[PDB]
Amino acid sequence: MERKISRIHLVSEPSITHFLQVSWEKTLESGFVITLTDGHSAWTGTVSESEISQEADDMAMEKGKYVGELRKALLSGAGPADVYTFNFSKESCYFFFEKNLKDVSFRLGSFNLEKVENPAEVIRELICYCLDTIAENQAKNEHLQKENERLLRDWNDVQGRFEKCVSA
Amino acid sequence: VDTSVVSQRAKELNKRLTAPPAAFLCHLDNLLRPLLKDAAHPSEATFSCDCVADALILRVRSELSGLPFYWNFHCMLASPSLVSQHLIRPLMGMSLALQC
Numbered sequence: 001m002e003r004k005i006s007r008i009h010l011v012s013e014p015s016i017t018h019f020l021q022v023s024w025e026k027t028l029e030s031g032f033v034i035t036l037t038d039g040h041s042a043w044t045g046t047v048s049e050s051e052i053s054q055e056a057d058d059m060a061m062e063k064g065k066y067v068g069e070l071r072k073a074l075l076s077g078a079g080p081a082d083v084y085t086f087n088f089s090k091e092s093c094y095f096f097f098e099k100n101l102k103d104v105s106f107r108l109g110s111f112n113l114e115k116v117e118n119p120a121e122v123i124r125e126l127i128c129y130c131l132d133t134i135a136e137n138q139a140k141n142e143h144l145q146k147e148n149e150r151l152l153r154d155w156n157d158v159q160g161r162f163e164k165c166v167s168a
Numbered sequence: 169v170d171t172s173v174v175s176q177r178a179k180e181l182n183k184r185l186t187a188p189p190a191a192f193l194c195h196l197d198n199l200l201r202p203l204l205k206d207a208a209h210p211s212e213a214t215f216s217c218d219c220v221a222d223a224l225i226l227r228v229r230s231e232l233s234g235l236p237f238y239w240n241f242h243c244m245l246a247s248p249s250l251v252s253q254h255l256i257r258p259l260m261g262m263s264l265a266l267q268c
Contacts, residue, residue: 101191103187104195106184106233
């Protein structure tokens with residue numbers, strides 16, 4: 001169960017930075033759970049395989065690149081030549097994200113979310129997951145540093161060893 | 169075709185768009201001009217032709233920024249005046265110039 005957090009600036013409220021978490025089981029094709037939050041309230045929704053397949057079919061685009069576009073948009077991993085915009089209608093709880101060209105707005109995806117009744121639980125879970133990831137990354141980095149020091153020492157010794165061997 | 173029908177046909181062909189006619193026509197020109205001006209220039213521009221009833225449906229499919237872009241020319245048989253003014257008189261002009 002992999003998760004990814006991203007920062008999105010909705011067009012409606014540019015001055016506020018919203019957080020969007022997307023969780024998928026094994027691959028992005030199998031459906032995902034999306035939770036949007038702003039620090040006080042959260043909305044959660046789910047997308048299954050059927051919905052993504054139908055959306056891909058409707059667009060008349062090859063399904064091999066629809067998943068790539070969704071990965072580049074929802075997960076916030078994209079180059080400088082592409083820009084995405086997200087809009088969230090509160091009353092209709094409708095969340096759609098699109099790709100913005102030069103005055104050529106193309107729609108990419110649209111979902112519907114439901115207001116959660118335990119915002120504190122969602123925020124606490126997000127913070128706890130972030131802290132756990134930070135700790136694991138720090139431990140892994142320390143281990144890698146130790147291994148690198150060991151390898152450097154071994155190479156430094158073997159240099160002089162080779163010097164002596166060639167001398168003899 | 170004028171600008172009014174461009175938006176309608178764009179809505180019908182490729183949905184979920186929010187672009188004005190000007191940008192659509194600019195994209196169409198940028199796609200078409202390179203091919204017509206010079207050939208043997210791969211530009212991911214699939215062209216197809218069909219006939220239904222005294223009409224010519226010319227379908228062009230392209231990818232802009234990695235997204236589909238479809239357009240259809242619903243050409244109809246030209247009037248005698250246009251055909252003459254565009255092919256007949258110029259041809260005789262060239263023939264006479266070459267004879268001179």
